């Protein structure tokens, strides 16, 4: 399925994902696309920080859901 | 992250927010906590009125930053 | 909001301020505009000397209110 990832500068990218994908996997895909190390990535959905070991399904992240990406050092 | 919101009577409250949160969202949270309609809320930071559609990141509002809340009719 | 500041020679200037601004901040703005050190500035409103640590709201100083500026050595 597709999900949207929106940055703090208002740019949205799309990712092909499955509900069984972990947040770790998602950050890995974002690295594949944008070259950002997963350690610098923060993903938030419905005001929550998303934990690396949990899946998208765990957070009820569905088709065409929007995650917010916040970079941190 | 946490931000402080200081009122005209010298009371400070705290809000859990993310850089991707809009000013609208922040006023919504203040309504959640205090029952003030967002339309009666004014938020200022560094002498600027904050616009509802912009985000905290847009205004460089970071961790433990202090917003000033001014109520208006 | 805007406030007026009237001098002893009958000159009025305008300042962009917020109710949460302290008298200290106001004197700082007057320094920004006119080069007068805050220590040489006295602000009065409704016959009262205004204290540096208090805010405009504390003194019920509102939109288009007029403060009187008295310089002292």
Swiss-Prot record, chains A, B, C:
Which residue numbers mark the site Interacts with activating enzyme?
A: 54, 72
**Residues carrying (Microbial infection) ADP-ribosylthreonine:** 66
What residues bear Phosphoserine in this entry?
65
Which residue numbers delimit the Ubiquitin-like domain?
A: 1-73
Membrane disposition: Peripheral membrane protein
The organism's superkingdom is given as: Eukaryota
List localization entries. Cytoplasm; Nucleus; Mitochondrion outer membrane
Tell me where the cross-link Glycyl lysine isopeptide (Lys-Gly) (interchain with G-Cter in ubiquitin) is found: 6, 11, 27, 29, 33, 48, 63
**Quick one: effect of changing residue 72 to G?**
No effect on ADP-ribosylation
Instruction: Reproduce the UniProt comment on modification after translation.
Output: Phosphorylated at Ser-65 by PINK1 during mitophagy. Phosphorylated ubiquitin specifically binds and activates parkin (PRKN), triggering mitophagy. Phosphorylation does not affect E1-mediated E2 charging of ubiquitin but affects discharging of E2 enzymes to form polyubiquitin chains. It also affects deubiquitination by deubiquitinase enzymes such as USP30. Mono-ADP-ribosylated at the C-terminus by PARP9, a component of the PPAR9-DTX3L complex. ADP-ribosylation requires processing by E1 and E2 enzymes and prevents ubiquitin conjugation to substrates such as histones.
Query: What is the stated purpose of this protein?
Result: Exists either covalently attached to another protein, or free (unanchored). When covalently bound, it is conjugated to target proteins via an isopeptide bond either as a monomer (monoubiquitin), a polymer linked via different Lys residues of the ubiquitin (polyubiquitin chains) or a linear polymer linked via the initiator Met of the ubiquitin (linear polyubiquitin chains).
Name the chain's protein.
Answer: Ubiquitin
Q: Which organism is it from?
A: Homo sapiens
């Amino acid at each position: 399925m597709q999900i949207f990832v929106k940055t703090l500068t208002g740019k949205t990218i799309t990712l092909e994902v499955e509900p069984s994908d972990t947040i770790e996997n998602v950050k890995a895909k974002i690295q594949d696309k944008e070259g950002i190390p997963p350690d610098q990535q923060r993903l938030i959905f419905a005001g929550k920080q998303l934990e690396d070991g949990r899946t998208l399904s765990d957070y009820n992240i569905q088709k065409e859901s929007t995650l917010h990406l916040v970079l941190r050092l």
